């Protein structure tokens, strides 16, 4: 009878009846003939946005990054408990497997947690001292500088070392005055025929 036909597809299997036939489908197919492949991805089962599809007797989800997992259930955040030491700044790599650190001054490293030795190249001025640091260095000054980098001839004029209005010029750690009249000494403390 009517299973001489061989009306089942998808691999099913033909009973005959009274009066017509029944297939038995394979796992995963349905219909009288066992046309339709059902669609496991009805239930909607792939969160964040990311696409089901249907399988024979099952799905898999295809993932929009930075989500990942069977069902998109994880995600990839390289940056999230900041890898970068030290103030520096994390960056998540285009497909978020890696990250990268920008540095603050001072430091390198994939993390930023090594130091940087500024005095190598040592950026003190006028015969000052280089000490390195952790994260940092420190000028320190010969007689006369002052500034970041030893950079700065102190003002030896202000407040102004010249008694009785006397004029000020400043030097390399020292200050010389012109005294106004009536007045003498390096300092212009001396006067001489006043009152
Ligand atoms: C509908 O969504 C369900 C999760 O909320 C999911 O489990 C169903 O998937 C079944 O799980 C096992 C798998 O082998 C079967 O094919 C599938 O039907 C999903 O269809
Ligand atoms: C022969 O197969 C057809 C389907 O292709 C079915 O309609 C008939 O009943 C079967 O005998
Ligand atoms: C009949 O039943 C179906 C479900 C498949 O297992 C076929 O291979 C079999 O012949
Ligand atoms: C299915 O694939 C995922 C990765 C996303 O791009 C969705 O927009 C798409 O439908
Ligand atoms: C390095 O050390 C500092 C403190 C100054 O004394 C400099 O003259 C010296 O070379
Ligand atoms: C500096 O020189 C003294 C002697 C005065 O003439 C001042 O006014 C000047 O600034
Ligand atoms: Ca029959
Ligand atoms: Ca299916
Ligand atoms: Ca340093
Ligand atoms: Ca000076």
Redesign the pocket.
């Known amino acids: 009878?009517?299973?001489?036909?061989?009306?089942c597809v998808n691999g099913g299997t033909c009973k005959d009846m009274t009066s017509?036939?029944v297939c038995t489908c394979r796992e995963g197919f349905s219909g009288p003939?066992c046309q339709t492949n059902i669609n496991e991805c009805a239930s909607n089962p792939c969160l964040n946005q990311g696409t089901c599809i249907d399988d024979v007797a099952g799905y898999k989800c295809n993932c929009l990054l930075p989500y990942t997992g069977a069902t998109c259930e994880v995600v990839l955040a390289p940056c999230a408990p900041s890898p970068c030491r030290n103030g520096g700044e994390c960056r998540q790599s285009e497909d978020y497997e890696s990250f990268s650190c920008v540095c603050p001054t001072g430091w390198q490293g994939q993390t930023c947690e090594v130091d940087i030795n500024e005095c190598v190249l040592s950026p003190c001025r006028h015969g000052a001292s280089c000490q390195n640091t952790h994260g940092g260095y420190r000028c320190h000054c010969q007689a006369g500088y002052s500034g970041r980098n030893c950079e700065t001839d102190i003002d030896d004029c202000r407040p102004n070392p010249c008694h009785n209005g006397g004029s000020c010029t400043d030097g390399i750690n020292t200050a010389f005055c012109d005294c106004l009249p009536g007045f003498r000494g390096t300092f212009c403390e001396e006067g001489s025929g006043l009152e």
């Open positions: 009878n009517e299973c001489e036909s061989n009306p017509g036939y003939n």
